[PDB]
RNA sequence: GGGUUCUAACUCAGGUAUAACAAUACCGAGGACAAUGUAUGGUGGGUAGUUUGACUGGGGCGGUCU
RNA sequence: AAUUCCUUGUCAGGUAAGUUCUGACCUGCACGAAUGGCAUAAUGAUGGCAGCGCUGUCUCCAGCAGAGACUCAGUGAAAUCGAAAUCGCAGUGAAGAUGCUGUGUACCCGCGGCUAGACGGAAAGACCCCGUGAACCUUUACUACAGCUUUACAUUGAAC
RNA sequence: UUUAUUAAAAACACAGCACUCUGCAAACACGAAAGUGGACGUAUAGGGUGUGAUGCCUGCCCGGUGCUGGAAGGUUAAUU
RNA sequence: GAAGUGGCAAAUACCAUGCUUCCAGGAAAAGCUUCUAAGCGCUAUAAACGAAUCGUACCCUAAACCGA
RNA sequence: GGCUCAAACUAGGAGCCGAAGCUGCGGAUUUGAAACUUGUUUUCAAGUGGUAGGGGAGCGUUGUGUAAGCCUGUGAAGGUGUGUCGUAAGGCAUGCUGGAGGUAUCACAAGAGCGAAUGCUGACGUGAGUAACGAUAAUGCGAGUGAAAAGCUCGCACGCCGGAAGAUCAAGGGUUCCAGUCCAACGUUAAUCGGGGCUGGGUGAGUCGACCCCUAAGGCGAGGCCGAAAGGCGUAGUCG
RNA sequence: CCACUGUCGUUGAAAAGCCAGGGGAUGACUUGUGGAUAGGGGUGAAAGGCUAAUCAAACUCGGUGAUAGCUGGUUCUCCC
RNA sequence: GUCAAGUAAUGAAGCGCACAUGGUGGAUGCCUUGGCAGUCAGAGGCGAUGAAAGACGUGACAGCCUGCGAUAAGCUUCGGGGAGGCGGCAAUAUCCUGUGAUCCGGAGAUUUCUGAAUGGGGAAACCCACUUACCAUAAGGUAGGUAUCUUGAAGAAGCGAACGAGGGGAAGUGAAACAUCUCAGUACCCUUAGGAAAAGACAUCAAAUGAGAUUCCCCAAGUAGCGGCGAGCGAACGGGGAGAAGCCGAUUAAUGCUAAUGUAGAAGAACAGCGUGGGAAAGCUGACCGUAGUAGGUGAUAGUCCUGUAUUCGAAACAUUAGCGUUAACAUAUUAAGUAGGGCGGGACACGAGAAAUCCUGUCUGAAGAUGGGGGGACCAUCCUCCAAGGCUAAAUACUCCUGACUGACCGAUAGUGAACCAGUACCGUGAGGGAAAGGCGAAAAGAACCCCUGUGAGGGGAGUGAAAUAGAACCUGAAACCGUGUGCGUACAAGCAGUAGGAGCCUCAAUUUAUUGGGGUGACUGCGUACCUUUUGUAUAAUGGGUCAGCGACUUAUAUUCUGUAGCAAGGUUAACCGUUUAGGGGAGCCGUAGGGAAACCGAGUCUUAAUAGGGCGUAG
């Protein structure tokens, strides 16, 4: 049956992505926190 | 301990031992239930007890003949092997000298002996004045110590 | 100071393994099991040092019940006889001399027998 | 000690000009009202925080509690 | 009666026989008129009852086909599991015993079946009670608050 | 139409009916406000509530609690 | 190293963004064609030369995606 | 079991069995009492079942000092046997293994002792060589290659789909595509085969799509409005 | 597109399916792509449904080692 | 010899126990490249000259890591250094190097694209431009410019530890419920600095002989108070210290001298013989250095073998710290009215409206102005004290993303960072986010030429190396669970926690002048005998928990307080913070004891109550 990951990669990059995360404070908080942690993936 | 914060898994139903942290003491890599902190060793010992204890050290010092009076130790050289002479010819090559007002090359020349240590009578402790094979004291720092205690 | 439990364990579960050999199965490979063996032998064995003095006595009686009847006289009598002779042998050299040596038993009978 | 009238505060989610929104100017309509701040009475499960005893031949019901 | 406890009410119809059904009575525990009343063609994978057809639903199961099961070769799980040299019975006993008493029976070990017991597995019983536990919901419980509203002062003035 | 994943229904909705609110910067709703939806609509409209095609219809009670109107009197805040 | 043209049938594709009816009344903007404003190139005829960059394999009712 | 002048019952008598009770023998220990008197010695008396719990005495382990010591390649720690000593915790010696450390004694400090917590991690059992091997569309044989062929290739025959189980895409994926080579792992079996490993290759546009021009919903939004701050809204626009 | 009945399956081929039947099938229809509404909030032809296999208040992190008169566990030895 | 009756022994499909020898597994021990907690100092930022963080490239060589940026493991120069070298896994090839390489330190050059990202846009690492100058003639190339805001060309933006200041501000919890209250002005959100910040010079306290800003520490003191007077909350005065400072420019940024530092470096003592051993640093014998003797290595443990250590020391260049000088930016009040005070509502004061001073202010008001005003805890009088409504000000105090040196009764691979290892990785999740596992041959690869079996596989056996190969790469040691093989004994007529007390037989070692004892293995047969933990009145319980093993896993730490022991002093005992060339010595502030009674004043071996001098209460070695 239908499941809950149904990929699209304008919607992902549209949600989730680097200019989305950048576009708010609580975003950029986001990607601060990444960094601090270290993550080799910031954004998806 | 890193991380830890969510529930492992819901509380029934799952047929395991019911679980808070992954970092509970009782898991591997947990916390220490009762992790130690840096703490303070040193205690209060009484005036009145120091002094009579190093009263004490000193008269045993005596009783045993671990204790050597001279006149002066002075080295007139910053150099190692007339300390050892020095100290052969007072037959105690291990001993702690003991003089009020150090020489800054009697200092050098004792710094390389290895069971020989020189202090100043201000600067003398139990656990020093106990842990060498003799003491080899000046009259001067003998009427300091009368003095001090 | 860490302290690691490992040697001092290792050896603590040995002894108990050690006390475990002949066991069956996991009584004498596995520590939980062996334990409780070796702790139920203990107390077998505690009981048996008291048991075994009851049971040598019915043995020994049981011999001299014999041989007084092979010489005409119940345990019963017979014991009161030795009592009233006052002969004190006791009932381990009694069943001994009994088993091994007749003709002295049937001596000691007929001591007992003279005496009732 | 209440009304009535006025306009100049204030209001316009009216017209005209300013490109558009808004502001501004004027006109028009209202107008010391409305509205808002502080204080205050009412209302207020719309929303919160909680309480809602114990004994007891299981509990509730009844009874009891000094 | 989707409503009636007594209750399978009573009487009629249907069956050989009907606590259901249909009609009627009214003694409505405890119907009733827009929390609508009484009907109503059409409609409904809606509820009840009755027939024809049809049948392996059944009397009462038989035979047959395929896929497993079974045997061989290859691969190779699972829950469970204190340890087991793990029988019946009548007793006993923390009160329903493979394990205790007495007794009876029983050579050692598989495989195919089977599910009477191992108070079998599975899920720290949801029932029930307890805890000065939780939550969410209700209200004419309490105490607040938002909102709505009253008046005083301010913004706020003039004349009669 | 509905309880995705044990309930598809007699439940919800429905066209239709009634009550009630609302004169427009509407009532009402989101929002702290600005700004919005209602609606570039305007009482034959829009909101809330109940009922639920249709046919025949829809009795009595305003004591309670709401709602609407009234204000003679009683009581009554801040303030003074 | 051949043939390659006649009949019949026939789409839901095309004519057709058409036509006819209905009410529940049916995107926008640009390209495109014209008109002028401030201000101070355009239309034909050709000839030559150009048209960048990215994608392009393969699965896709699936063993390649979403379901460990 | 079996029992009848009992192996039943009543009334008496004498023997004997029978407990971790009592006695005997040896040993330990608590308290108290007496004396060489901090175990220095001998005794004596009364004691010594024990959960919750109180009191007393110790064992071992890691680490610090003692220790620039002492032990140790003539073999440390650890492992694994054996012998021996103590009331116990445990100590000591030693064979084998091991191959570089250990630590007397007395103090001192604890990450100081594990069988349970449906404890935590790893390893490995039992179930059990049991169930299953994922659509009942289906396979047979001959050749080939190969260590080996039911499964690969080729051939003949058979069967299945055919509004698909054929073909083209979008989305998503990202090399899976093609060739050669390999068969450990992966593939629910084998595999010479593969979407597996390894090495190479392969995607060619003015016209197909994107980009680009344009805008929808909806975003963002010089100025502007609003809001403790953060921010919210909104015009022109700018994206989409 | 849906999900009424039954068998099967229930350590499944599958954390909701298969098979055989069943309903709607020009409409209040189904479906692609993009967008909007966010947690006491949303959305709801209303089942407390749904809001990423999570819903009478999502998820993640943090307050936080919440609290737990409750349950479990609590590791060497000997003597009184 | 027949028959009859009776009675042994032998059996093993398999299984048990012990021992021997392996497999698996990876404990233990040793080890460390990594962590953890601090001390003494330094520093406290980076960025429009484009940061943090990335993407994509870059090599003789395929990937990853590291460095670097189309000048791409690098280019120039200035110093150091002196023989090797072209980063690691990780070697190979071509080569470079005394014409001074590699390497180290200072400076410079280059520095793709993304990202504040800044020419516009955007699904980050992409798409699309405009414009100036020049060059080209074609469809371009080179060098620039073009965001927004603030201030009048200069700045800003963004990022990043903790500590500061400020704007908002929970709840769980505690009160054995809960609402005041607590938690707590905490968590968290938001804003914004500096090396610190803030505060700071009296419109402050005190009531003493008065003192003299701020901050921090020890006391005062868990006192006075506050408080559903509950749970709790909790000062100040003053004393002792650290540090001291007062001003009206105690500002900021450059530049230039002088000094010092730092950023590479240099030299640097002294051991031999013999024996063992694979190897000597260890043993025996005898020497030497020491301003250098407990450093890390080296084939076992080294003052004399190496690197080091003690000691002495270097700088072309750049940074930093100070002192000086100078510049250019900003600042430079002149004594303070919408102020003090007041009404209402709140907040902060230890203080919850209280008899509530004092501070702050949303709302409404509103002085005096030195012949005046503020405070002294309602308020009034007197007395003391001090002048708000202008601004500033070092130190002593807070901290650690970092740099250097040093330290540890800190860990040692389930520990210590989550991370010793290509870890914030794999993996999981739409996402925010969650989040592992995983170290060790040997001294040196000497990492096993060659031969044999096998499919040119895997794996092994020889040969060889090595001290050692059950050290052979899954490699130190190599436990247990678990699973084999071998040997000995037992076991196929017998009912149950599997042992125990006895006990025959057999097997095996030793003695012993020779089948008897002793040791070991097994255990026919007899008696007895229902696991452990937990929880209970009571459990074989058919009540709980555990499949097993290994490893880990639970009464701590800090402070206060009371009692006990012990030690020192003793009617006295003891200092704290601090200072200290630091366990000492100094520091007597304070605390406890030495007297109690009473609400208190007050009195005191007494005192309280009372009219009472009575009675009665409480009182009469630390
Ligand atoms: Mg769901
Ligand atoms: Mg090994």
């Known amino acids: ?44 | 301990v890193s991380g830890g914060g969510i529930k492992p898994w819901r509380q029934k139903g799952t047929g395991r031992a019911r679980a808070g942290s992954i970092r509970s003491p009782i898991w591997r890599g947990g916390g220490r239930a009762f992790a130690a902190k840096p703490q303070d060793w040193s205690q209060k010992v009484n005036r009145k007890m120091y002094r009579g204890a190093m009263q004490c050290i000193l008269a045993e010092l005596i009783r045993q003949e671990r204790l050597i009076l001279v006149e002066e130790l002075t080295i007139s050289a910053p150099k190692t092997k007339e300390l050892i002479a020095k100290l052969s010819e007072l037959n105690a090559p291990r001993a702690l000298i003991i003089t009020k007002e150090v020489d800054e090359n009697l200092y050098l020349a004792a710094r390389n002996i290895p069971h020989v240590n020189v202090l100043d009578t201000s600067e003398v402790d139990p656990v020093s004045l106990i842990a060498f094979d003799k003491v080899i004291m000046s009259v001067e720092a003998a009427k300091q110590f009368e003095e001090a205690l | 100071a860490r302290v690691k439990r490992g040697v001092q364990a290792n050896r603590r579960h040995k002894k108990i393994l050690k006390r475990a050999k002949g066991y069956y199965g996991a009584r004498s490979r596995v520590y939980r099991v062996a334990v409780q063996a070796v702790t139920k032998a203990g107390q077998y064995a505690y009981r048996d040092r008291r048991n075994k003095k009851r049971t040598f006595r019915r043995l020994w009686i049981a011999r001299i019940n014999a041989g007084a009847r092979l010489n005409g006289l119940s345990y019963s009598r017979f014991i009161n006889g030795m009592k009233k002779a006052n002969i004190t042998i006791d009932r381990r050299v009694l069943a001994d001399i009994a088993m091994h040596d007749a003709a002295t038993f049937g001596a000691l009978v007929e001591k007992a027998k003279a005496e009732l």
């Open chain 1, 1 to 44: 049956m239908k499941r809950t990951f149904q990929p699209s990669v304008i919607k992902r990059k549209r949600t989730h992505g680097f200019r989305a995360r950048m576009a708010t404070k609580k975003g950029r908080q986001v990607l601060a926190r990444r960094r601090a942690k270290g993550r080799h993936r910031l954004t998806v």
